[PDB]
Amino acid sequence: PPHGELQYLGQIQHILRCGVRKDDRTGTGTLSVFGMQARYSLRDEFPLLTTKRVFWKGVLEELLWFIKGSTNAKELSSKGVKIWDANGSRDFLDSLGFSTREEGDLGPVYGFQWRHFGAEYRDMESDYSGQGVDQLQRVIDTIKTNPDDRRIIMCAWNPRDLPLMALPPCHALCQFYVVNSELSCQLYQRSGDMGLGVPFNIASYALLTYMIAHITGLKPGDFIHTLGDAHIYLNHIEPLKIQLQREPRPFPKLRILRKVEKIDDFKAEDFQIEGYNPHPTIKME
Amino acid sequence: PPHGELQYLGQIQHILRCGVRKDDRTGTGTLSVFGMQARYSLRDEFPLLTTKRVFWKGVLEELLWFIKGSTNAKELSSKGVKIWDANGSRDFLDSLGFSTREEGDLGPVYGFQWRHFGAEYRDMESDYSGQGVDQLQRVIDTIKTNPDDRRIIMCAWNPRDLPLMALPPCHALCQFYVVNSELSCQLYQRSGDMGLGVPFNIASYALLTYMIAHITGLKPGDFIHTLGDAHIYLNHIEPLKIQLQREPRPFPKLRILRKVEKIDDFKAEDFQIEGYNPHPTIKMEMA
Ligand SMILES: O=c1[nH]c(=O)n([C@H]2C[C@H](O)[C@@H](COP(=O)(O)O)O2)cc1F
Ligand SMILES: O=c1[nH]c(=O)n([C@H]2C[C@H](O)[C@@H](COP(=O)(O)O)O2)cc1F
Structure with a gap:
């Protein structure tokens, strides 16, 4: 079976081959395609890209911060x-x-939407216990009680709260799906910087799937990444061509180090990436 | 140049070959794949399927009803x-x-969520003017002023409102995209009855994109259909196998008959499907 990474690499090649020039909110230029989809096996492997080092500690720490419901950058910064x-x-x-x-x-970005969707935002220090829809706990409950459900969705896109957020979310929603004891997840990402953002983003949601699989007693199945505006910044086209020469090495494994019963009880030292051997680190603006 | 209907037909074949048996809430049984995506050109053709008759009057009438913001099944019924x-x-x-x-x-289904997202639903008769976000007008405005925007989204999935809904939206969100004066649209459909729902759902969003392209002076580009739980109900297998042997006829064209200024202005008779001559209707039992 081909390496899972070839999916991401072939997306890059497709945008280089077929993407069209499109200006951006900053003014740097992109090659762009609208509508892409890739499937990454989570079975006995973890798709942390190997053809350039991904910031694993950032992935894990950011996700724990979302799960806490924090909208305070300082709480992530201290980590x-x-x-x-x-x-x-x-x-x-x-x-x-x-x-x-x-x-x-x-403001009310991912951690708030995930734990308290639809509540009135006050500030980052306010008490939100019992307010809004805890979508993350809802998904976990449904997976355990009704695995066949076709509505296992967590949404971060909230039109009312959009003007209040420091940045509109890129990860608009995700969906979970259970068959044959296997948990899968599909992310709808409205906008993906293929060089700098997407490898990180793939790691976050694969990791979120491992976590929910662990707590619901399921095995990780597939992560499906769906993109809206999939783009490469003009100033990454050269770095990316460097990258496309590199042979993916086998993906690492992700180990969870103790049995954890509740999504909130996870901590950074609960997790060990095993056998991550990425190619030479490549910097990108 | 391959016929765009082969995208849909390909999906049916993929699920029949590789789908896994999965029960549903309806007790019927399905073959299921999670995560699929197909692309339909809207350039000089409208993807209204030809291997079976699709209910076009339904597509058009249901969309005008969403657009008007109605949550009254009776207002659609009367048409x-x-x-x-x-x-x-x-x-x-x-x-x-x-x-x-x-x-x-x-309850607060598509029509309300498109024109009044986040407003407090009362009943189907209430005046909702100036309450909630008019996501539909917001998409149109953004297209007119900043077509490069990577945030042109309309979401119908509203966790807060799900308890009051007759049933939860299948069409969770769509996203619009503009390049080279062409307007594209991507639907995220959480759950797709490939036999009975999907061909209609494809024509709804193709139609919405033609409408928005018309009022923004753009040309329709691509319709990207993304699915979550793409399924075939077990009692659709036999009728879909009949459908799979029919040869696609050329997609029709869709014509808009006057220049129209606001999306709320369109009426049914502003549109003409031209050259639509499908293979016969194929009955498929509802779950
Ligand atoms: O998690 C993310 N991943 C990502 O790739 N982006 C990229 C996409 C785009 O290049 C930019 C955000 O800009 P915009 O709002 O215009 O799409 O950041 C942003 C994130 F938050
Ligand atoms: O526009 C639609 N298209 C569609 O394919 N369904 C199907 C998907 C599923 O077969 C069922 C809704 O069930 P559930 O809510 O369990 O996914 O209806 C429903 C719609 F409204």
Whole structure:
């Protein structure tokens, strides 16, 4: 069977071959395709891309932060992961017109939507217990009680809350599916920077599937990634061509180190990537 | 150049060969694949399937009803289209524990979520003006002013509102995309009855894209159909095998008959399907 990575690499090649030039919200330029889909086996392997190092600690730490329901960049920052720090800075907030906001306050982005969808956002320090729909606990409950259900969805796209967020979500929704004791997940990603974002994003949702599989006693099945605007920044086309020469090495395995009963009880040291041997690290703006 | 109907037919074959048996809430049994995606050109052709007659009057009438923001099965019924009638009936409403509610009252389904997302649903007769987000007008505005936008989304999946709905939306969200003066659309469909629902669902969203292209002065591009649980009900197998042996005839064209200024302005008789001559209707039992 071909390496799972060839799916991502063949997406890159497709956008180079067939993507069209499209300007962007910043002004750097992209090659773009609309509508793509790839399937990554989660069976006895973990699709952490090998042809360039993926920031695994960021993936895991960010996901734990979502699961907590945090909308405070500082709480992620204190764990050594700075990827949301800019969006919560004083200048950034002011330039969205959020001048009365405390620094760190991303507004109602993924952690809030996942744990408290539909509640009124107040600030990042407010008490939201028992408010809004806990979609993440809902998905886990349905998987255990009704695995056949075709409505196992967690949605982060909330039109009312869109103007309040520091950044509109890229991961608009995901869906879970159970057959034959195997849990699968499909992510609808509205916009994917193929060089810098997508490898990270594939890791997050594969990891979210391993976690829910572990707690519901199921085996990980497939991760299906669906893209809206799939794009390569003009200034990555060269770096990417470097990457396309590299032979994928076999994906690592993901080990969960103890038996965990509730999604909230997971911690970073619960997880060990085994046998990750990626190619030479490649920097990208 | 291969016929676009082969995309749909290919999917049927894929599920028959590789789908796994999976029970559903309806007790019927299905063969199921999770995650599929097909692409339909809208360039000078409209993908209304030809290997069986599709209910076009239904497609068009149901979309105009969504657009008007109606949640009243009776308003669609009066136009001759009965597909939401069962869901807005005494017996059914009762069985969802909505003893209180009036016949026709589907709750906050597509029409409400498209024009009033996040507003407080009362009943099917309330005036919702200026409440919730008008995601449909918002898509149109963004297309006119900033066609490069990677956020042109319309979502009908509203966790908060699911308890009040006659049933949860199959069409969870769509996304629009513009390049080279061409408007494309991607539907995320969480659950697809490949026999009975999908051919209709393809024509609904192809039609919505033609409409929005018309008012924004763009040309229709591609319709990308993404599926979650793509399934065939076991009692559809025999009729789909008959369908698989028919030869696709050329897709029709869709014509819009006047220049139209606002999406709320379109009426049924503004549209003409031209050259639609399908293979006969194929009855398939509802689950
Ligand atoms: O998790 C993410 N992954 C990702 O690839 N992007 C990329 C997509 C796009 O290149 C940009 C966000 O911009 P826009 O809102 O215009 O699509 O970031 C953003 C994320 F949050
Ligand atoms: O537009 C639709 N298309 C469709 O294919 N279904 C099918 C999918 C599934 O067979 C059933 C809805 O069931 P559930 O909610 O269990 O997925 O109806 C329903 C619609 F409204």
